Structure formats: structure tokens, C-alpha cells
Symmetry: C6
């Protein structure tokens, strides 16, 4: 049960969009193309009905009114599919490529060995509880301490990231790094765990088209790591083109083949706040844990 895509496109054109436009005060000043409407449906909603669709159309109209405040214009400003991220932010869903779409409680990390690099996904669940923490996937002691440092940083910054103020005694956290049997260790997934934990707690989905590596200090400083070449090659080979790396590793980028560096967008960071701002979509997509 629900509307077909055709029905959603039509009800948006005929009812939802004109309603949201007029309620935003923008009637006659902005429009959306058919392709824009379909992109909103496909990449910004996931539902049987159209409540979400209507909310997204309202966001577009209100963002239009913001542009109007910056400066008026004559005639119709037409929003096409290519314009949608300007109004709605980073796509929330990617039905054609689901594995790299944003997800609540996950983050894409990078590991290395003497023979090369490996992508690893950090998974975190936040469930009703009492402040317990589980750390699984055969994690070594250094990596476990890294998770603890990330969690403490978040406990000290609940306001900044929109985390529940009482999660420390009403939520249990579980950090898991598949695959289950393979030992893993080291401090370089500090920012990756901070991202996944913050996502799980806030219910804001983390982008999965970005891979990252960096040690985190307790106060949130991003510290240099090893295996830059191997990790970035592994990302590139897996079709990830957006990277987060510590600022103190900038010198190691010279070691990549120019062709690989060419197809990578690298964000250098000094503070974990920069990571969380880049990785976490602004709006929660699931109800609160408790």
C-alpha cells in the first residue's frame, strides 16, 4: 500500500508543491521541474505515502524565501534536478547505489597491512539501556581505548552535535567492526568511531561516499596516522573519491600516483568537529533512541 512514483509526481505537482509554495510566500517566484520533483522523491524520501515528500517541498520553498531575502529577482526561478542539493543538501538516499548512501550509525574506515589497504565499515547501534558499551569484531586494546576516547569526547559535547543529554545513563552503545573473525587494532579509526557513534546517537545519517582515517585525542584533536598510500589506494579502488585525512599527514599525499590523487577529493582536518560537520547530514532520519 502507498502511492506509485507516477502518483507521487502528480500529487506533488498538483497539490503538495503549490501548497508549500504559497505557504512560504513564494507563489510566482519559484518553480520546480518534473525532473527535480522526481529527484526529491527518489533521493530525499523513503516512504509509502507523501508526508516526507511534502516536508521536502516545504524545505525547498523556505530555502527559496531565504534566497529572496538575500536578494529579490524578477520572474520565475526554476529549480531543476541539478539544483536540488543547493536546496535540500546532500542526497539522503541513493536507490541506484544503496551501499554508499548515508546511513545511521555507520562510517567508512580504512585499514592497512604489509601487503595493502582495506576498507572497513564501523557499525554502531544505540539502544535503550543504562550506559553500557560493547566493542566487538576482535578489536585490540588500543582500538578499544580509541572508541572510549571518541565516546568521551561526545559525552562532553552533547549540545554541539544534537546528542541526547542523558544518553550516558539511558542508552547502551555497541560498536562492531566486521568481519567477525579478523583481528583489528590501532588508533587510526578514532574519527571513524566518533562519526558512527555520533550518527547512532543523534539519528543523523553519516555519509558513506566518504572514507576516513585519523586518530582522535580526548579533546577532539585529529592526529596523524600511518599507511596513507595504502589506505587511499584502497579507497580509490573501491570507488570512494572523497577522503578525510589528518592535516599532519598532508606531506604523505606526495606519495600517491598523480592519476590517483587526481580523482580524489581530500579534506584535511585538525579537529573532529570538522569531520562530524562534513559527515553527518543535518536532519535526523529516525526517532530518538528513548
Amino acid at each position: 500500500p502507498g502511492y506509485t512514483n507516477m502518483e507521487k509526481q502528480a500529487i506533488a505537482r498538483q497539490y503538495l508543491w503549490p501548497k508549500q509554495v504559497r505557504e512560504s510566500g513564494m507563489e510566482g517566484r519559484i518553480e520546480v521541474t518534473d525532473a527535480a520533483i522526481l529527484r526529491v522523491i527518489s533521493e530525499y524520501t523513503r516512504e509509502a505515502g507523501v508526508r516526507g515528500l511534502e516536508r521536502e517541498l516545504g524545505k525547498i520553498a523556505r530555502k527559496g524565501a531565504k534566497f529572496w531575502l538575500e536578494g529579490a529577482w524578477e520572474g520565475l526561478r526554476t529549480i531543476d534536478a541539478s539544483d536540488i542539493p543547493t536546496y535540500l543538501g546532500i542526497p539522503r538516499y541513493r536507490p541506484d547505489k544503496a551501499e554508499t548512501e548515508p546511513q545511521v550509525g555507520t562510517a567508512q574506515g580504512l585499514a592497512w597491512t604489509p601487503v595493502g589497504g582495506t576498507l572497513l565499515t564501523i557499525e554502531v547501534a544505540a539502544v535503550p539501556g543504562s550506559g553500557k558499551l560493547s566493542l566487538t569484531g576482535q578489536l585490540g586494546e588500543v582500538m578499544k581505548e580509541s572508541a572510549q576516547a571518541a565516546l568521551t569526547y561526545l559525552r562532553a559535547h552533547t549540545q554541539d552535535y544534537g546528542l541526547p543529554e542523558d544518553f550516558y545513563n539511558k542508552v547502551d552503545l555497541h560498536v562492531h567492526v566486521p568481519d567477525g573473525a579478523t583481528p583489528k587494532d590501532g588508533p587510526s579509526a578514532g574519527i571513524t568511531m566518533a562519526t558512527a557513534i555520533a550518527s547512532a546517537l543523534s539519528r543523523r545519517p553519516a555519509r558513506m561516499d566518504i572514507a576516513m582515517t585519523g586518530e582522535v585525542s580526548l579533546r577532539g584533536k585529529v592526529m596523524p596516522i600511518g599507511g596513507v598510500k595504502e589506505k587511499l589506494l584502497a579507497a580509490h579502488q573501491a570507488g570512494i573519491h572523497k577522503i578525510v585525512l589528518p592535516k599532519d599527514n598532508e606531506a604523505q599525499l606526495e606519495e600517491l600516483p598523480k592519476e590517483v590523487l587526481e580523482g580524489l577529493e581530500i579534506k584535511l582536518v585538525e579537529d573532529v568537529g570538522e569531520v562530524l560537520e562534513y559527515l553527518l547530514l543535518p536532519e535526523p532520519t529516525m526517532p530518538p533512541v528513548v
Copy 2:
């Protein structure tokens, strides 16, 4: 004390069925054969009296009314024994073959060694408690972490599977894998433990005519395993013909003898939700834990 099977058959024909038919609005449109009634008794009830029997007959009649809504028909639609699963679902009891009948808190898993495969039953009890978890049967650390990942997945999906919302602090769980003395390890019983735990918590019995293998991620992804040939041979040899296997192991099926593959029905899965939907009968057969 109770009714004989003969008495149950007769009271169903004379009182229970006609009552349920007329209350469903289907008098004159549907009938059941004597063989159908006996199958309901034998495979869908387990009781001294006939309260359960009457409930099952009501289910048949209401399912009839559903078919009527899809499309009316002229004359009598007669439900025979072979038709009963269309109306009542998968048989709940198999008095002739009790060991493969559905059971609350069990699931059929598959293990391997350098010399072949072995069927292993995962047992789970859910009892009044305070959120404690016991893991017994000489389980290694990887297998214990697998149980923890399965449990966390279920804690995060209580609505989806009809689990109690407060089981995390009102229920103790105990996962046991006989036999008691034999060491066991590995991540490949993740879906098997998820099935047994979900069954115990929901009081919905898990089918025991299906054997399964698959690693589970925290978010419920089913991940590939080893020993596909050995495990499937072991299932076949034990007379299990229905298998659940990770989608990522599809390539390993080529290794089975055509004759063995011939007599196996294999369901490939990517998400643990697909497993639980296939394994767990929809209706609970025991009262809630608390």
C-alpha cells in the same frame, strides 16, 4: 482428561466449524473435508480441549472471507487437507516427525571441520530477569561476539519482529549450543542465533525443517561464510532439504553434486529480516516471558 481425536473431529464438524463459518459471513460459500479437519487438529493444535481448534477454524473462515473480497465465486469452495497451509500457514506441529517441527527458541545451524559438516542446534531461553546474557556450550570468543551482535540487532528492531519493548531490562537470555563438552567457534551462526533469540523473545516458534548458515553484521547484513559444501552435505544427509545461505556464497553452490543440489531448496539472503520472516511462524504459541 480431554476430547478424543474422534470427538474433536465430530465437535468440529457439528458445532465449531459451522459457528465460525457463519460468524465470518461465509455460510454456504466454503466447506472443509474430514481430512482437512483432522489435519487442523493434528498439525495446528496441541491441547486437551478444543479452544485452539475453534480458533484455527475461525482463521480458515476469515481467510476464506479474504479470498471472497479478492473475488466472489459461485457454489462451494471445498478446503481439503492439501489446501490447509494456504489458509493456516506452515504446520505448527508434526506429531509424526516431532524433531523437525517448529519450536520456540531453537534454530538449526551447520558447522564444519576438516573432515566434514555437522548439524548443530542453537537453543535459547528467555526468562524473567534483568538483562543478563549467558552463552554456554564451550563457545569461543568470536562466536560469543556474534551472539552479542545478533542480540543488539534485535534490541534495535523490537517493533519489527514483535519483541517486548522492555526485554533489555526485564528478561535474561541464555544461548546454549549442545553438546556441552565440544568446543565451538566462529561467526557463521550469526543468523542462527538471531533466529533462536527472536523466537525465544517473541514466543513465535522457529521452523526446524530449515538449516542455515551466515554471519550477521550489527545492522543485519548477512555476510559470507565457509564450508558451504560440507555444511550442505551434512544438512542433506540429515534429511533437511531447505537451506538459508548468504547471497555472497551463491558461487560456492556449483561445488555440490547435481543430485544433492537437486533435492535442496536454497534461499539466498542479504539481510537478517529475510531470515526471520522465513523462519518464524507469525503467531506466538506461548505466553510472554513477563
Copy 3:
């Protein structure tokens, strides 16, 4: 202070028995011999006074009335000493042979080594507490897990065996297997621990003229064990003639000398419920733990 046996015999004949008979509606239909009365005193009571005696006489009379309901008779049905167990069940006390009389919280188990078998008593105390479990007598990890599986089975079946519904958080249990210094291990005392724990919790005494061996699954399945010959010889040598053994060990009975098998009564079991029904006297002999 109390009555002598002579006084108890006389007060039973003159007051207690005729009172209980007439209150049961059986005056003139049943009688007891002097030897029957003395057996009731000796094997079914343990007290200074005669409250217990009077209760047992009431049980005899009411059981008489039950036989009357099955079918009336003419004249006097006289109950002699040999008839008493038909009316009162298995003797509760054996003053001439105290070591094999039923006891609250004990069960007779059987162990083996490369040189032969050994009887071992499992002792369990249930005391006011908070759900703690102690396991002592130098028990190995497999044997400890066996105790845990037995306890969980009982937690899941409190109604079936008349266990307190809240024992899991109001009672502490202590399982001890003397002698203190000797290491012990293995899963084959699962049914033995289930018996002793159920007895301690229910305050129903367990028979000590029966020796047992069997692994228990979490759902109560009795599983095969080793050392059948050695264990049964050890029982026989110690003057125990009643044995409980897993059904799956039936084939091993062929290995016993015909003369030994001749003097043993062996009960083959598939479910722990069969064990508890055979071992535990129906009526509690001590007040509840809390």
C-alpha cells in the same frame, strides 16, 4: 518431649484414624492394620507430636474414597503395611537406612575414570538471596555450564515443578559436589543437578535410592553420556538398584554382566521432566525458602 511410638500407635488407632475415616465419608469401608499404622509413623512422619501422622491418615482415607469412586465394594477393605505405598506414595523416611531416604536438595550422580566408576552426591542449598549462584567442589567449566543450563531450564518451567515464581531474584543457590579437594568435570550430571536444584527450590525431597546420569540440553532434552558400564557397576556395588539413563544409551546396556543387569531397574529417559517426575516426591517437606 513428644509421644512414644507406643503412644502414637494407640492415639492413631483410638482417635486420629477413626476421625479421619469418618471425615472422609469412609466409615465401615476401610481399615488399617497395626503394622500399617506403624509404617506410617516410621516411614511417613518425623516429628515429636502427631500432626503429621494425622495428616497422613487423612491422605489414606481420602485415597480410599477415590478408590470407592472408581468402584464400590462390599465389606471392609483392610490396608496392611505392604499396601501403604499405594495410598501414601514412596516412603518419605527410612529410619533403618537413612542414607538412601529422600532428601531435600540432593541427588545421586555417577562419575567415571580410567579405572572405574564412583558414586557422587550433588548437594544444593536454596537460601534467601538475590539470584546469585555458587558452584563449588572443584568443578570444571563444562560442569559449571551444565549447572547453568539446568537452572535456566528450571527458571523457564516454574509452574511445571511447583517452583517459586520469583526465585530468580529472591533466592541464592549453591551447588556443591563433595569431596572438596577432588576435581570434577563433564556434562553428564545435567539431570542430576536439575534434580537437586528443583528439589531445593520446591522443598520436595529427591529420592536417594535412584542413581542417575545424563547430559541436559537447555530445553530439557536428555542426551547420551559415557562410561555406562563403569557407572552402573559402581551403582550396583554401592547397593543402588534403580537407575536413570538416557534413552540414547540403551545400546550400551548390553555390555553389563547379565547378573548385574538382572538386579538393576533401569529407566530410560528422553526429557528431564521424566526424571523430575520419578525423583521428586510430590509434597514439600520443608517451608518455602522465602
Copy 4:
């Protein structure tokens, strides 16, 4: 501040004794000698004043009235020093020999090594708490389990020995066996720990002119031990002449030199209740723990 012994003797003769005699109904029927009064002071009181003295004199008079009930007599029954234990029980204090006087929370145990026996004192404190147990003096695991078995036995028999019903969650226990550095192990101080723990909990002092050895089962059975010759020689050499030994060790007594056996009084026991009845004075000498 307090009375001198001379003042206590005189106030007893002139006021306390005649008051207690007449209040007991025994005026003219019983008397005490000066030596008897001094023994009451010295061996049954420990105080600045004479409240305790007066209580003991009342006990003598009431015990006199008990003898009167058994049978009257003509004239004066005069109680001399040698008669005092008949009226007041075992001496509570021994100012001339303080180390063997009864004490709250201690018991005299016996250990052995390849070169001989050793007396060891078991010390137990019962303090306000929450059910915690500390076991110190470099005790091995078997000896620690022995303490646990003794404590559980006492938890199951609070009525029998006059222990507080709620000690399990309002009292912390600490068992210590000096000297601090010397490792100790084994099950043979089970009765010794039961004695010291029961004494500490009940505030009834344990005799220290008796040395003991015996393993305890959970249900209180006293089980045989080793090193009988070495332990009894060690007792004899230390000037202890009263021994408690398991009944099952009776055969080992033959090994002692006739001269040593001559000067030993040995009590053979089968149940820990027999030990506690012999060791613990009937009346508490300190206020309750809570």
C-alpha cells in the same frame, strides 16, 4: 572505676545472692560458698560493676528451682566452686589462662605438613554490611570453597543456631587465618570455619580449649580428613586435650601413642550441628552486629 573483687564478693553475699534466691522461690533451700561466689566473679563475669554478677546469681537460683522441680530435698543444698559449672555451664572467662578461654568469632583448627602438625586459629569478624565475604591469610581455592560451604550451611539454618535472619544482606563477613604470609589450603577446616562464623554471627563465644578438624558438606555432613596423627600430636603438644574429629576417622586413632591417646578426650562427629552444640556457649556475650 568499679568495684574491687572484695567489694563484689561482699555485695554478692549481702544483697545480690539473697535477692536472687528469694525472687526464685528458693530461700532456705540453696546456698553458695565464698569460693563459689568468687568463681562466678572470675570465670563468668567481665565488668566494672555487678550487673552481670547479679544475672549469673539469678541463673544459679533458677537452676536450683529446676532441680527442686525434679525432686525436693530437705535442708540446704550448698553450691561450692566445683559445682558452679553444673549451674552456669562452661566457664566463660579464664583470667589465669586467657588464650584458651571462649571467644567470639574464633575456633582452633589443626593443619599438617610432611614434617608435622600445627595449630591454626580461624578468626571471623561479622560487621555491618551488605552480604560481602572476605577470605584472607593466603587461602587456597579449596579452602575458600570450604568457607563458602560452611557459610551456606549457616544461611540455611539461621533458626537452629540463633543467627540473625537477615545477616545475608545486612552483615559483611571476614574470615582470616593468620599468619598473614603462610599459604594455607585444604577442606579440613570446614567445621572450624562453621564454628567461627556461627560464633561471630550469633555473638556466642566458641570454646578455645577444644581443637578440631573435619571437612563439611553443604548439608552439614562431617567428612573424613588426613593427618590425624600429626594434628592430634600438635594439639597435645600445645596443651589442648579436647578434640573434635570426624566419625569416619575413628580407625586412624589407633596410630597414636597410648600415652597421648590417654590424655585426649575425643568427640567423634557425623554432623556439624554436633560440633556447634559442643563448641558454642549457649548465651551471647556481645550485642548483635546490627
Copy 5:
């Protein structure tokens, strides 16, 4: 959103300063230069608005009134940039050199190895909690005990340092010493941990232009350490010129090159109170933990 620096300078001159001066009773007696005002903005405030600025100007004026009380003067006392620390204390912020500015919950420690010295930062977070303590960064047992001793000292001196009276059961502490992978051990960061913990709890920032080393006793005595030469060279090389050292290490200062000793200011301490008074700015810069 906020004021530009130019706007802050002007609003201070025109409104904030004259208001604070007249409210302090000092109109006509004190003035501030433009450079002084800019230093207040840059080194004593960190904010979008000017509430903090106005507070600091009020502090200057009230400190002026204090000087007036010590002795009046004729004419205008003009406060220039070089005078600001006399009025406002040690600079709170150093925008040009942020890494050595004071920070809440950090302290600069010094370590050594057989090949030289190393600066290490101790990080501490104080978060809502229940009295838990985490110690991470691969710290050895001696170093962990050192943290415990520092924390206990602070628990015993809450009044002295303005710590919350209930932090012991309402706050969790986490001490972390990056980098995550490198093992660290020893007692010589006792004063360093005391500083960082006291800072985190009090929300008073610790100076980071001072490096320190010293063992702490439970009662706060500062005890001598090793590696004085290596540690002080490492400080000097990193551009730290202010050192805290135990008084008992004064003799080791002779070992430094005269040129290095020349550019170091060394504070010798005997008590941790001297350390905390030197390191912690007097006023908190963040709200309380709970």
C-alpha cells in the same frame, strides 16, 4: 553574527568602559589605551558579542579601585597593553599561539627514554556520570596508581580548589595521554594529572606555557623524579620556558648547559597546592559539569 573587532574596540571606548568605570567609582582616575582595549578583546575574551568584554572591563575598574584603596593618586592612571596582566591576570587566550594558551582539562608533562626527553599532554574530561574513572593511552600500572592518588587528593580538597562537592558520585572522569599506541608508565606525572583533573573538574583552565614533572603522594607532597636533564632539554627545544620541578631535584639542575638554564624559569615545589595555584587560572571559563 557578532561584532567586528573594530566595533568591539569602539563600543568598549564609547559605552562599556565608561559605564564600568563610573559604576566602580573611578571616573576621572583611570583610563585605558586603545592598545589595552584590543588586548582585552584578543587575550581575555572569546565570543561573538561583548558580554565577556564588559565583564573584563569591570574587573579592570574594580582592580583600579583596589589600588585606590591602597593609596590614592592625583590625575589619571593610564592602563596600557603591557599593564593589562596586572589587572586581569595571566592571558586566557593567545590567538597568535593557540597551542600554548590555557585550556580546560589539559596539562603539559615531560617523559624520558634512554635516548632523550619528550613532551606529552595529559588530557582529562569531566562529564556527567556516577564516579567512574577511565585511564587510557596505554598507561602502565604505576602510572594508573599515580592518577588514582592525584584524584583522591582532589576528593579530599574540594573546598581548596573550588571543585564540586559531589563530583565523586555525579561525574565520570577520563584521563587520556596521547598518542594512543605508545606505552607510557611511571609516577612522575602525578602533579601533571592533578593539574589536568583539577582543571577539568573546576572548569578553570590550566596554563600550557608551563611544563611540569613530579611524583605526588596521597597527601600532596611533591616527590623527586628522574630524567631531569632530558625532560628540561625537551621542554626548551619545544619552546616552553617555564618549568615546575620537585624541590628535591634542585641538585640535578647543575647538569643543564648554562645557556639552557639561562632561558628557563624554574619553580621548585614541595606541595601540589603550589602547582595548582601556579597552573590554574582563578576564574572558570566553562559551565559546571552537572
Copy 6:
């Protein structure tokens, strides 16, 4: 802020002393010299004001009235500096020699090695808490058990030493023995820990001009130790001339050089109560822990 010593001397002579004398009823019967007043200030007070001074003068006057009760005298009894300890007890403060002055929660212990003896200070903090105990300074298991035995003894004797009745669940204790890195072990600091713990709990300062050694039993017996010669030499060399030693070590004193024994005052003890009476000043000098 406070009074100068000159002002304190004068205000005592002119106001505080005559007030306290007349309020005690001793006007004209007792006097104090200027030197006595200065000793009271220096060795019995530590304060900015004179509240403490006035209290001490009141103690002197009331002690005078006690002497008067023992026997009157004619004329003026003049109290000089040398007399002050007769009236006020052992000096509470020693400004000229602070390291050996009495302190809350410390005690002077003695250790040995194959090459000689060493003074070691036991430090104890009592802080608001919940009954937790920390034991630090790299203490071995025997030494930790010794601390536990000392603490239990104190828990059983709260009335005797003026300890809080509820410290067992409202106070956390921390025992620390510097230096942090050096391993320490053995039972011979039992009395030393009992002293420091009792001091911390009672807030009564322990003398630090006395060094001690002795094992403690749970019931408070002081037991013999080793290294008497080495320990006493170490004390002597450090300028400690007052020693507490077990009575059972009296024979070892013969081994000291006559010259060393000459300058030592040795108190032989059998019970820890004797130690605490000698070590702890009678009046608390700090407020209660909770």
C-alpha cells in the same frame, strides 16, 4: 589576615587566659608564664585568629581544676613551658620540625631488605564515598590482605576509637605507600595501616615521632615480625627514637648495639588497641569526612 604572634601573646595574657581561668573557677590558683603561652600558640594552634588558642587555654584551666579536685594547694601554681604537655597532652604541631609532627591519616612504618632497613610512610585518605577501598604503591597480595584485616578490625570497633558508625557505606578509603614505583609486600605494616586508617577516619592525628612494625590479626593481636635489627637501625639513623614493636619480638632486641638501644624508647605491644592509644592524639583536628 590574622593576629601576629606578639598580638596573640598579648591578647592571651590580657583577655583569653583570665576569662578562661575565672570561668573554670580557678582565679588566683593558677597562672601561666609568657613562655607557656607562646608554646600553646606554637605547638597547639594553627590558625589566623585565636579561637583555637582560647580553647587550649580553657583546657589548661579545666585541667588545673582537676588537679585542684585531687588536692587543693596554697598560693599560685605557675605553669611554665615545660609543664604544658602535662595540661594539653602531646604537642599537636612542631613548626621547627614539621615532618615529625602529628598528622591526620599517616603513620611511620619500617621495611627491610637483604642490605638494610628503610622508613616508609603509610598514607590514608578518607573521603566521601560508598565503602570502596583503594590500595596503591605497588603493594603485594599479603600486604593488601593486611590492610583488609586492619580495616575489618576497625569496622568492628567503631565505638572504641571514635570512628563514624556508618563509614563502611559512606566513606571511601585509599591507602597509599610511596614511593609509587617500588614494590612493597609483607604483613608487618598491619599495625601501621591500622594506625593510619583509624587516624583518617577519626580525624585524630597520628604521631610521626614514633616508628612501628607489627603484624595484626583480625581480632587485633599484634604478631611477631622480621628484620628487627635492620628496622630499628633505620629508625635510629633517621632520628626517630620512639618505637612500637610486638611483645613476641622482645628477644630480638638483644641484637642491637647497646649504644643504639640506649637512645631508643621501645614500647612492646600485644594488642592493636595499645598502639592506637599511644599513636592517636585524643582530639580530632579536622571536621568529619561526611
